[PDB]
Each structure stands twice: as structure tokens, then as C-alpha cells.
């Protein structure tokens, strides 16, 4: 199977309330293991997984220094971006940052990425070639100019092809029992009449990993998109996730509708009928 590691960085300015609020979280696929908070009393990188507490002091304090370098970076990025859009200092703004690498079944380098976003909208992102960039607006073109003239994209590809992938292999070994697991979703459907001639058919999928899953409804072969009530994949809090879809059907023709669950943990795509 394929695995991934991602780091997420969020900085929100506080006009007239001091420093900006910085938060950083690291992930291995859909499993969190590190995290930092600017308002926490610890003021250092904290573990958020049992298999990551095995690290020594060099690893712990070494990442606290790098998350502080990322925090002060966004602190300066807010003032620079504020001038790119001619904004005042009385408004709060958000800069978002994420990068990481992917590995396949053989745990070889799949794809590396690094993207920025200012106030929700995309700003700049490293392409798949890991050497050229993609500027969203003209304000991002200014950032592209400074980073291509300094040739700073090659050191990024050096980190995405080495330190990221090589240390991603380590976590998959130290947390082998928790990371290289694939739990099949527990599927079922519920029936509840909402009106005299209407009923709600909710297709369920519980306790699955990873979180990516596809639950779809079909009526005798044709798929439903406008009537299907889909909610985002929610986590149960124990590592596994949940998801349900629903369609309101006239009472009496429920035998025509069928739910289809697609998940990698399933040996074959299963179908629930009536």
C-alpha cells in the first residue's frame, strides 16, 4: 500500500493583540504524531502518538527549533503579504503552509509537494517536477521571482527526496502496528419512515482505516448525485473513521436502491441490497 507524511502550519494574525497565533501539526497518512501550539505553556514540540515518544532529546529539541523557525517565518510572511494586497493592519489574516512526501508499495519516492495559501486562497505551490513553481495570482509571481533567482527550489527537492522519505520509512517501522494497518469498514443500512409515503435510507460505514472511502447509492443501476445526502468523513477519535450517506425514497420501492462501498481494506467492492 501507499503511505504519506504531511506537515501543516497555520498562522493567524491578532491585530492589536500581540504576536500572531501559530499552530503546527504533523501527520503520517491520517495519523497525527507531532504538534506545536503558540499559546500552550509547553512552548515546545509535543508528542501526539505513542510510537513517537521513543525519540531521544536530540530529536525532540531539534524539532522545537525548526518549528520556531517556521513560526517566525510566517510572522514575517504576514507583513510582506499584507503589502502585496494593500491591506491595513487592523484586519486579521491567515497564512497556511503544508508540505510532505509520498511513498508507494515498495516505499520508493512517489511525489513531493509544498504549497502556500493566504487567507484561504491558493498562493504558491511547488510543481511535480520539484524545481519549478506555480503562482496563483500576480502577487505570487513576485514570490516566484525571488525564489527562482536564488535557486532555492533544489534544496527543497533534496529534502523531499531524502530526509522526508527516509524518515517516513522509520515511522512506519516504529509504529508498524498502528500505521501499516488496514481495517475494513463495518457497513450497514438503516430504514426510518419520515412521512406517510417516504423513508430515509442511510448507508453506514464504521471503523475503517485509512479515511478515504467512497459510499455511493444506485437505483437499479443508475447512480444518485443530487438526492444523495453525503457528509464528510468523520473520525471516531480512536484512529478509525466514520461516514454515512442517505437518500429519501418513496415508501415501497426500497428494493430498487443499493449502496456500494469502495475501500482499500475490502478484498472486493461490496454491495448491500434489500
Amino acid at each position: 500500500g501507499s503511505h504519506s507524511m504531511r506537515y501543516f502550519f497555520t498562522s493567524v494574525s491578532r491585530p492589536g493583540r500581540g504576536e500572531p497565533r501559530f499552530i503546527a501539526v504533523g501527520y503520517v497518512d491520517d495519523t497525527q504524531f507531532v504538534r506545536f501550539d503558540s499559546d500552550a505553556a509547553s512552548q515546545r514540540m509535543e508528542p501526539r502518538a505513542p510510537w513517537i515518544e521513543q525519540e531521544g532529546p536530540e530529536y525532540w529539541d531539534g524539532e522545537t527549533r525548526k518549528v520556531k523557525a517556521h513560526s517566525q517565518t510566517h510572522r514575517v510572511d504576514l507583513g510582506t503579504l499584507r503589502g502585496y494586497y494593500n491591506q491595513s493592519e487592523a484586519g486579521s489574516h491567515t497564512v497556511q503552509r503544508m508540505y510532505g512526501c509520498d511513498v508507494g508499495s515498495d516505499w520508493r519516492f512517489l511525489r513531493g509537494y509544498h504549497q502556500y495559501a493566504y487567507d484561504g486562497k491558493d498562493y504558491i505551490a511547488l510543481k511535480e517536477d520539484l524545481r519549478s513553481w506555480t503562482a496563483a495570482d500576480m502577487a505570487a509571481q513576485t514570490t516566484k521571482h525571488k525564489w527562482e533567482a536564488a535557486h532555492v527550489a533544489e534544496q527543497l527537492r533534496a529534502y523531499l527526496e531524502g530526509t522526508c522519505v527516509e524518515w517516513l520509512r522509520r515511522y512506519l517501522e516504529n509504529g508498524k502496528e498502528t500505521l501499516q494497518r488496514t481495517d475494513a469498514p463495518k457497513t450497514h443500512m438503516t430504514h426510518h419512515a419520515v412521512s406517510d409515503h417516504e423513508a430515509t435510507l442511510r448507508c453506514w460505514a464504521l471503523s475503517f482505516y485509512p479515511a478515504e472511502i467512497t459510499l455511493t447509492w444506485q437505483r437499479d443501476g443508475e447512480d444518485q448525485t443530487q438526492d444523495t445526502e453525503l457528509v464528510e468523513t468523520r473520525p471516531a477519535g480512536d484512529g478509525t473513521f466514520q461516514k454515512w450517506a442517505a437518500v429519501v425514497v418513496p415508501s415501497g420501492q426500497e428494493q430498487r436502491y443499493t449502496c456500494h462501498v469502495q475501500h482499500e481494506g475490502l478484498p472486493k467492492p461490496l454491495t448491500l441490497r434489500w
Binding site: 506537515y7 504533523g26 530529536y59 531539534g62 524539532e63 525548526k66 518549528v67 523557525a69 517556521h70 517565518t73 514575517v76 510572511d77 510582506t80 503579504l81 502585496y84 508540505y99 513576485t142 514570490t143 525571488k146 525564489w147 536564488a150 532555492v152 527550489a153 534544496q155 527543497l156 529534502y159 530526509t163 522526508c164 524518515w167
Partner: peptide
């Protein structure tokens, strides 16, 4: 691990 270097400034 995280990145030790940087991309520069915006």
C-alpha cells in the same frame, strides 16, 4: 522530519 532550511522570503 521538518525542513531544516528555508525558501527565503516572500
Amino acid at each position: 522530519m521538518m525542513w531544516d532550511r528555508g525558501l527565503g522570503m516572500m
